[PDB]
Design an enzyme around this catalytic site. Structure first.
Site, PDB file in Angstrom:
ATOM      1  N   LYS A  12       0.827  -1.208   0.000  1.00 36.21           N
ATOM      2  CA  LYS A  12       0.000   0.000   0.000  1.00 36.21           C
ATOM      3  C   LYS A  12       0.864   1.262   0.000  1.00 36.21           C
ATOM      4  O   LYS A  12       1.850   1.362   0.711  1.00 36.21           O
ATOM      5  CB  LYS A  12      -0.898   0.001   1.218  1.00 36.21           C
ATOM      6  CG  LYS A  12      -1.865  -1.191   1.277  1.00 36.21           C
ATOM      7  CD  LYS A  12      -3.065  -0.963   2.191  1.00 36.21           C
ATOM      8  CE  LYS A  12      -3.680  -2.311   2.527  1.00 36.21           C
ATOM      9  NZ  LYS A  12      -4.104  -2.443   3.953  1.00 36.21           N
ATOM     10  N   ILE A  15      -1.313   8.103  -0.516  1.00 34.86           N
ATOM     11  CA  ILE A  15      -1.754   8.887  -1.670  1.00 34.86           C
ATOM     12  C   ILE A  15      -1.243  10.321  -1.635  1.00 34.86           C
ATOM     13  O   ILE A  15      -1.321  10.963  -2.680  1.00 34.86           O
ATOM     14  CB  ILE A  15      -3.279   8.851  -1.859  1.00 34.86           C
ATOM     15  CG1 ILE A  15      -4.009   9.597  -0.743  1.00 34.86           C
ATOM     16  CG2 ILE A  15      -3.760   7.433  -2.096  1.00 34.86           C
ATOM     17  CD1 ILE A  15      -5.526   9.607  -1.053  1.00 34.86           C
ATOM     18  N   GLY A  17       2.243  12.498  -0.811  1.00 41.92           N
ATOM     19  CA  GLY A  17       3.651  12.498  -0.457  1.00 41.92           C
ATOM     20  C   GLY A  17       4.262  13.905  -0.578  1.00 41.92           C
ATOM     21  O   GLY A  17       3.618  14.820  -1.092  1.00 41.92           O
ATOM     22  N   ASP A  44       9.033  11.708  -2.073  1.00 45.24           N
ATOM     23  CA  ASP A  44       9.461  11.502  -3.458  1.00 45.24           C
ATOM     24  C   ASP A  44      10.813  12.164  -3.662  1.00 45.24           C
ATOM     25  O   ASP A  44      10.966  13.363  -3.468  1.00 45.24           O
ATOM     26  CB  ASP A  44       8.439  12.133  -4.432  1.00 45.24           C
ATOM     27  CG  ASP A  44       8.851  11.858  -5.865  1.00 45.24           C
ATOM     28  OD1 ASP A  44       8.654  10.697  -6.327  1.00 45.24           O
ATOM     29  OD2 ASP A  44       9.422  12.753  -6.537  1.00 45.24           O
ATOM     30  N   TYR A  49      18.155  15.272  -8.226  1.00 49.45           N
ATOM     31  CA  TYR A  49      17.807  16.471  -7.433  1.00 49.45           C
ATOM     32  C   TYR A  49      18.971  16.907  -6.564  1.00 49.45           C
ATOM     33  O   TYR A  49      18.945  18.046  -6.056  1.00 49.45           O
ATOM     34  CB  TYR A  49      16.565  16.224  -6.526  1.00 49.45           C
ATOM     35  CG  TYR A  49      15.314  15.827  -7.299  1.00 49.45           C
ATOM     36  CD1 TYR A  49      15.179  16.004  -8.676  1.00 49.45           C
ATOM     37  CD2 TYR A  49      14.220  15.271  -6.623  1.00 49.45           C
ATOM     38  CE1 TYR A  49      14.017  15.618  -9.347  1.00 49.45           C
ATOM     39  CE2 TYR A  49      13.059  14.851  -7.291  1.00 49.45           C
ATOM     40  CZ  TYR A  49      12.994  15.045  -8.648  1.00 49.45           C
ATOM     41  OH  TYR A  49      11.847  14.643  -9.313  1.00 49.45           O
ATOM     42  N   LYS A  78      14.457   7.544  -8.034  1.00 51.48           N
ATOM     43  CA  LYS A  78      14.388   7.412  -9.491  1.00 51.48           C
ATOM     44  C   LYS A  78      15.784   7.232 -10.055  1.00 51.48           C
ATOM     45  O   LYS A  78      16.740   7.938  -9.657  1.00 51.48           O
ATOM     46  CB  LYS A  78      13.732   8.644 -10.118  1.00 51.48           C
ATOM     47  CG  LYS A  78      12.443   9.067  -9.392  1.00 51.48           C
ATOM     48  CD  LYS A  78      11.697  10.182 -10.161  1.00 51.48           C
ATOM     49  CE  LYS A  78      10.643  10.824  -9.295  1.00 51.48           C
ATOM     50  NZ  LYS A  78      11.179  11.777  -8.309  1.00 51.48           N
ATOM     51  N   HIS A 111      13.359   7.345 -14.356  1.00 54.07           N
ATOM     52  CA  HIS A 111      12.952   8.766 -14.273  1.00 54.07           C
ATOM     53  C   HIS A 111      12.379   9.289 -15.606  1.00 54.07           C
ATOM     54  O   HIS A 111      11.369  10.019 -15.599  1.00 54.07           O
ATOM     55  CB  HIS A 111      14.166   9.581 -13.813  1.00 54.07           C
ATOM     56  CG  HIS A 111      13.808  10.910 -13.198  1.00 54.07           C
ATOM     57  ND1 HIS A 111      14.617  11.443 -12.194  1.00 54.07           N
ATOM     58  CD2 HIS A 111      12.811  11.780 -13.452  1.00 54.07           C
ATOM     59  CE1 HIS A 111      14.098  12.613 -11.884  1.00 54.07           C
ATOM     60  NE2 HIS A 111      12.986  12.847 -12.610  1.00 54.07           N
TER      61      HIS A 111
HETATM   62  N1  LIG Z   1       9.121  12.457 -12.353  1.00 60.82           N
HETATM   63  C1  LIG Z   1       9.533  13.671 -12.751  1.00 60.82           C
HETATM   64  O1  LIG Z   1      10.088  13.838 -13.826  1.00 60.82           O
HETATM   65  C2  LIG Z   1       9.198  14.866 -11.875  1.00 60.82           C
HETATM   66  C3  LIG Z   1       9.180  16.154 -12.441  1.00 60.82           C
HETATM   67  C4  LIG Z   1       8.738  17.265 -11.707  1.00 60.82           C
HETATM   68  C5  LIG Z   1       8.355  17.023 -10.381  1.00 60.82           C
HETATM   69  N2  LIG Z   1       8.455  15.749  -9.835  1.00 60.82           N
HETATM   70  C6  LIG Z   1       8.138  15.518  -8.399  1.00 60.82           C
HETATM   71  O2  LIG Z   1       6.941  16.218  -8.041  1.00 60.82           O
HETATM   72  C7  LIG Z   1       7.156  17.117  -6.950  1.00 60.82           C
HETATM   73  C8  LIG Z   1       6.130  18.287  -7.027  1.00 60.82           C
HETATM   74  O3  LIG Z   1       6.337  19.036  -8.282  1.00 60.82           O
HETATM   75  P1  LIG Z   1       7.094  20.445  -8.290  1.00 60.82           P
HETATM   76  O4  LIG Z   1       8.236  20.528  -7.313  1.00 60.82           O
HETATM   77  O5  LIG Z   1       7.429  20.675  -9.752  1.00 60.82           O
HETATM   78  O6  LIG Z   1       6.040  21.600  -7.986  1.00 60.82           O
HETATM   79  P2  LIG Z   1       4.678  21.778  -7.135  1.00 60.82           P
HETATM   80  O7  LIG Z   1       4.579  20.793  -6.024  1.00 60.82           O
HETATM   81  O8  LIG Z   1       3.583  21.905  -8.207  1.00 60.82           O
HETATM   82  O9  LIG Z   1       4.890  23.287  -6.648  1.00 60.82           O
HETATM   83  C9  LIG Z   1       5.983  23.535  -5.717  1.00 60.82           C
HETATM   84  C10 LIG Z   1       5.939  25.064  -5.523  1.00 60.82           C
HETATM   85  O10 LIG Z   1       4.722  25.463  -4.866  1.00 60.82           O
HETATM   86  C11 LIG Z   1       4.992  26.176  -3.673  1.00 60.82           C
HETATM   87  N3  LIG Z   1       3.965  25.816  -2.689  1.00 60.82           N
HETATM   88  C12 LIG Z   1       3.827  24.604  -2.060  1.00 60.82           C
HETATM   89  N4  LIG Z   1       2.752  24.586  -1.245  1.00 60.82           N
HETATM   90  C13 LIG Z   1       2.197  25.796  -1.414  1.00 60.82           C
HETATM   91  C14 LIG Z   1       1.027  26.457  -0.809  1.00 60.82           C
HETATM   92  N5  LIG Z   1       0.277  25.795   0.086  1.00 60.82           N
HETATM   93  N6  LIG Z   1       0.741  27.712  -1.168  1.00 60.82           N
HETATM   94  C15 LIG Z   1       1.495  28.357  -2.081  1.00 60.82           C
HETATM   95  N7  LIG Z   1       2.607  27.888  -2.679  1.00 60.82           N
HETATM   96  C16 LIG Z   1       2.956  26.599  -2.346  1.00 60.82           C
HETATM   97  C17 LIG Z   1       6.383  25.768  -3.259  1.00 60.82           C
HETATM   98  O11 LIG Z   1       6.985  26.832  -2.475  1.00 60.82           O
HETATM   99  P3  LIG Z   1       7.902  26.557  -1.183  1.00 60.82           P
HETATM  100  O12 LIG Z   1       8.668  25.272  -1.420  1.00 60.82           O
HETATM  101  O13 LIG Z   1       8.788  27.839  -1.209  1.00 60.82           O
HETATM  102  O14 LIG Z   1       6.975  26.504  -0.003  1.00 60.82           O
HETATM  103  C18 LIG Z   1       7.050  25.569  -4.611  1.00 60.82           C
HETATM  104  O15 LIG Z   1       7.516  26.846  -5.160  1.00 60.82           O
HETATM  105  C19 LIG Z   1       8.633  17.496  -7.174  1.00 60.82           C
HETATM  106  O16 LIG Z   1       9.213  18.221  -6.029  1.00 60.82           O
HETATM  107  C20 LIG Z   1       9.211  16.105  -7.427  1.00 60.82           C
HETATM  108  O17 LIG Z   1       9.296  15.393  -6.172  1.00 60.82           O
HETATM  109  C21 LIG Z   1       8.825  14.669 -10.539  1.00 60.82           C
END
Ligand SMILES: NC(=O)c1ccc[n+]([C@@H]2O[C@H](COP(=O)([O-])OP(=O)(O)OC[C@H]3O[C@@H](n4cnc5c(N)ncnc54)[C@H](OP(=O)(O)O)[C@@H]3O)[C@@H](O)[C@H]2O)c1
Length: 316
Positions: A12, A15, A17, A44, A49, A78, A111
């Site tokens: 499990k 949902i 992370g 994650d 990173y 990844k 990845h």
């Molecule tokens: N598999 C892949 O290729 C891949 C690609 C992209 C992402 N990912 C994974 O997905 C995760 C999430 O995606 P992401 O990092 O692109 O972006 P996200 O989670 O869509 O957005 C992160 C941004 O939102 C801000 N934030 C978070 N909570 C908030 C809230 N309650 N109010 C206002 N702003 C808020 C954060 O600011 P602060 O941090 O300054 O609070 C940060 O600037 C990544 O960190 C990674 O683990 C995987």
């Protein structure tokens, strides 16, 4: 809203992370410690990173302090594109395990479907700027992933950024031993992914939604770009429910039976983002959010658009 989803390996997965892309190494240890204290059980991570050691310090302290047991954590990492070669996969996994201070991962993902030339550089370039590919194909990389399950280093394996044809390629692999447990893809109201999600779910593959807030800290942001957190239509749905816009954007994928991994390093937002198990979006609200699709991507891997395995030429 149950907190975990059953994967096709029998385990499990929580949902919700915590994402760690772009989390600075001097802030991510505190971010992960706060997240575990406030209830997160899924982190994650990724070698690319460059912050797994600091994530691992947090995990180790919370296990040592007995805030949580290892069996209750679900840690994901990844395999980076420069390690798709058969002889490099195990060492890549073991480096991640050593950094995270773990003796197994709950889930290890390819990845991207694109393999690159091995070496120190994560994006090896030719003298003109194109990514230099690997000749390894993704079926041989999947066989190397399966070996990690059989060696006890990972409990589940999966994929990320694979399109429907590439998922099908793995599912149709001759001699397939383990199906992917997860496909982690970008998904939010501006990139709703209906067709690929339907496909994966129909095959028993769980989908994880990345960049659920639209990644407002992505490096390549241009103010002309759409902004989910500032969309007045989404703010109005949040206002109706007395929640924040981020809480609506996190609840949205949960109600599509997706896993979601919002990133924050801000303690107040880490806690707020977890408080999404106490309200429901209506079916009307969900359909309205889905109607905002514009096929807009945060992560388009633009340096790799001529790679044979580039995923996003494909309708889905
Ligand atoms: N598999 C892949 O290729 C891949 C690609 C992209 C992402 N990912 C994974 O997905 C995760 C999430 O995606 P992401 O990092 O692109 O972006 P996200 O989670 O869509 O957005 C992160 C941004 O939102 C801000 N934030 C978070 N909570 C908030 C809230 N309650 N109010 C206002 N702003 C808020 C954060 O600011 P602060 O941090 O300054 O609070 C940060 O600037 C990544 O960190 C990674 O683990 C995987």
């Amino acid at each position: 809203m149950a907190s975990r989803i059953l994967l096709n390996n029998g385990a499990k997965m929580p949902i919700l992370g915590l994402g760690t892309w772009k989390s600075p190494p001097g802030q991510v240890t505190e971010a992960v410690k706060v997240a575990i204290d406030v209830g997160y059980r899924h982190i994650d991570c990724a070698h690319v990173y460059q912050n797994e050691n600091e994530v691992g310090v947090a995990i180790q302290e919370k296990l040592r302090e007995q805030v949580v047991k290892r069996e209750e954590l679900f840690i994901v990492s990844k395999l980076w594109c420069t390690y798709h070669e058969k002889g490099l996969v195990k060492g890549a996994c073991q480096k991640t395990l050593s950094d995270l201070k773990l003796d197994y991962l709950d889930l290890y993902l390819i990845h991207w479907p694109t393999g690159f030339k091995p070496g120190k550089e994560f994006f090896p370039l030719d003298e003109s700027g194109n990514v230099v590919p690997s000749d390894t194909n993704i079926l041989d990389t999947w066989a190397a992933m399966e070996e990690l399950v059989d060696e006890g280093l990972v409990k589940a394996i999966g994929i990320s950024n694979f399109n429907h044809l590439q998922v099908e390629m793995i599912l149709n692999k001759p001699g397939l031993k383990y199906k992917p447990a997860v496909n982690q893809i970008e998904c939010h109201p501006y990139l709703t992914q209906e067709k690929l999600i339907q496909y994966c779910q129909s095959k028993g593959i769980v989908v994880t939604a990345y960049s659920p807030l639209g990644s407002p800290d992505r490096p390549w942001a241009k103010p002309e770009d759409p902004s989910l957190l500032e969309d007045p239509r989404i703010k109005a749905i949040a206002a109706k429910h007395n929640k924040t816009t981020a809480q609506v954007l996190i609840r949205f994928p949960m109600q599509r039976n997706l896993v979601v991994i919002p990133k924050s390093v801000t303690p107040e937002r880490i806690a707020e983002n977890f408080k999404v198990f106490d309200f429901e979006l209506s079916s009307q609200d969900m359909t309205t959010l889905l109607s905002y699709n514009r096929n807009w991507r945060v992560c388009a891997l633009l340096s790799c658009t001529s790679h044979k395995d580039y995923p996003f030429h494909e309708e889905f």
